[PDB]
Nucleic acid binder design. Sequence first.
RNA 1: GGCCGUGUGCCUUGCGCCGGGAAACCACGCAAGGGAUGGUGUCAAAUUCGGCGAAACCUAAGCGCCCGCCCGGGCGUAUGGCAACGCCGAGCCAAGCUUCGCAGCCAUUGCACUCCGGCUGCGAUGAAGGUGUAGAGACUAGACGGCACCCACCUAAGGCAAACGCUAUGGUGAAGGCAUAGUCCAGGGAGUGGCGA
Length: 95
Amino acid sequence: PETRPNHTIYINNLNEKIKKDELKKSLHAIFSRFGQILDILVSRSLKMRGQAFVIFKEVSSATNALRSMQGFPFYDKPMRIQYAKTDSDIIAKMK
RNA sequence: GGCCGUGUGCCUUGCGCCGGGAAACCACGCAAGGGAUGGUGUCAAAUUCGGCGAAACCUAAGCGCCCGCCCGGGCGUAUGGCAACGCCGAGCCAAGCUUCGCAGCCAUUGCACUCCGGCUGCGAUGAAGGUGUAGAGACUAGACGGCACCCACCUAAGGCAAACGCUAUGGUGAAGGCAUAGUCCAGGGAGUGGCGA
Ligand SMILES: [K+]
Ligand SMILES: [K+]
Ligand SMILES: [K+]
Ligand SMILES: [K+]
Ligand SMILES: [K+]
Ligand SMILES: [K+]
Ligand SMILES: [Mg+2]
Ligand SMILES: [Mg+2]
Ligand SMILES: [Mg+2]
Ligand SMILES: [Mg+2]
Ligand SMILES: [Mg+2]
Ligand SMILES: [Mg+2]
Ligand SMILES: [Mg+2]
Ligand SMILES: [Mg+2]
Ligand SMILES: [Mg+2]
Ligand SMILES: [Mg+2]
Ligand SMILES: [Mg+2]
Ligand SMILES: [Mg+2]
């Protein structure tokens, strides 16, 4: 079910009524204690809606977030988590 | 209401002729004429403040000329006017179109890094157009207007076709809304008084 580890995590199955500006705040409290968040990519577009990308400094931050926050009911919806299949544009330039 | 004339707008035609266009054919200049100008639905709101320009036409203060000079007059003239109409600067506005948020139904389970799915609904912005521009003015409706679409003719870039060729998203179907069709309210027909020459 889970692919190979990454700096960023893929999140799906979310309530699409919430705005772009509001949803970025909710993640900066629950996941910020698992490790410091560099940047959050969220879009409401048809291809990118109900999806979020959370960038950590180290892999261990996301690996525990994968287990401890698995199936977390978010806005009355079961939140799924997978690893991102590609590195971020800011992350890849540092590696 | 009719007939003639001047001006300005208009189309047809002929001429010129550069500019746009792939072509049809638009745009520009002028002369002459008035034979010819497609259809249904749609939307009715803003309708303000200020500025620039105008032909014929009406008139003759100044000036010029003349009546041999003066007293008078005459003759020309707009630089005075009316006004068909050409327009700028700002504000504003129905529906349709561009974009932009905010709700509402509807689809959607989607791996990004640059924004971006459909609608009906409000609320806003942007472009076109309208208003400003009626006899001082107030209303009402359509259209000769904004929008959508249809019909005829003409072209064929692009797309289609192996091919004679097919096809509008491109042209033609005038202007009049500086009040058009109407209803009151002017003005004149019809008086008195300024200002003016
Ligand atoms: K006439
Ligand atoms: K030419
Ligand atoms: K204007
Ligand atoms: K008008
Ligand atoms: K062709
Ligand atoms: K057409
Ligand atoms: Mg005629
Ligand atoms: Mg009204
Ligand atoms: Mg004298
Ligand atoms: Mg004299
Ligand atoms: Mg005269
Ligand atoms: Mg004059
Ligand atoms: Mg005015
Ligand atoms: Mg008129
Ligand atoms: Mg008008
Ligand atoms: Mg008039
Ligand atoms: Mg009338
Ligand atoms: Mg009188």
